[PDB]
Design a protein around this nucleic acid. Sequence first.
DNA 1: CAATCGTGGGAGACCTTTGGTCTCCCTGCAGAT
DNA 2: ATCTGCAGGGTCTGGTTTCCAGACC
DNA 3: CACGATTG
Lengths: 163, 163
Amino acid sequence: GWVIGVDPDIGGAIAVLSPDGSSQVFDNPFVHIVVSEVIRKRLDTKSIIQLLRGLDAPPGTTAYIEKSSPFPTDGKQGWWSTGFSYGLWIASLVASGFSVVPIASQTWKAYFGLMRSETPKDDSRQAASILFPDKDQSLKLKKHHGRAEALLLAAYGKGLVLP
Amino acid sequence: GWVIGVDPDIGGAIAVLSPDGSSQVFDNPFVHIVVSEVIRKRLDTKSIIQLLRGLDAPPGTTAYIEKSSPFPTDGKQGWWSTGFSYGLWIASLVASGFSVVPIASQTWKAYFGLMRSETPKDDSRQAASILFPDKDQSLKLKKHHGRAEALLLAAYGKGLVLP
DNA sequence: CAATCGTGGGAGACCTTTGGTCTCCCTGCAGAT
DNA sequence: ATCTGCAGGGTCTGGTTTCCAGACC
DNA sequence: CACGATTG
């Protein structure tokens, strides 16, 4: 009945689907940090864990998380940060009682027919709006594709289908 | 009082110092994982959380953790893994109730007079043997430097000094 | 704040002290015992 | 099982597959 | 994707 979806990146999000069909999606909490004398964004460990502790999803609920798979052409910092986000979320989810299933981007994109798209981010928001019409206003912006990815991971995990 | 030290990497370890002077150190739990058709060690998230939950250190105890600082010349996989281990430990520690204080390796090495050695791993084990003589048997092997780093991080936060 | 674009990048602590100097890991995989 | 050495590296799902093709942040 | 930077 309950399913969680997590886009773990800095502009990512967590989506919670209840058995009555309602849904919530939360932007990933972050803070601004100093590194090598510049500012950078970092996930907010305590707010994530606090977020997970107030969810109504019971222990045992499966959380489907986007598998970390950076391109070899991405910088060493890209690799560090996606590795870090992944581990922070995985530990946080496990410590808060949820079962964690990593899902490759190719898996849920094939499942919703999103593969090989020229506008993959827009498409993911369009698909999330169709599957979660009451979230349509929370998906209007280009920067909301993180919210879309989370909802689509949860929708994948629940076995939802597009019309 | 109570202090925790964490070497977060795959051969790392967590050390726990109690107020009566006694000490425990545990090797970091790991599992073997298939990745891109080869086998790789990865930290064991469940076992880490379970270990933290069995510690007698009370809530709010400070956990000193080695800051992740990979070299610009380490490969992107190096960056991903150290980022991943760091995030996994930080979240496990916050979620289990401990305060987290990252410590740069240069900080506890300067504190114990270990800067600029040509056998830094052996030296770290030697220093932790002197600080924790009842752990001397658990530091015999060169692969035990991670146990030594965890113990020294904890010794740093407790303010211990070498004779 | 929201978008977009192009390339892929250390970070840290203390000093010489408002910028300079110098220090620091680890992963992943072959091979030897 | 422990260690030594050395350069710094994608990974993943469908292939009704035996390593390939194509795909992804 | 992250990391900078620019542009309304």
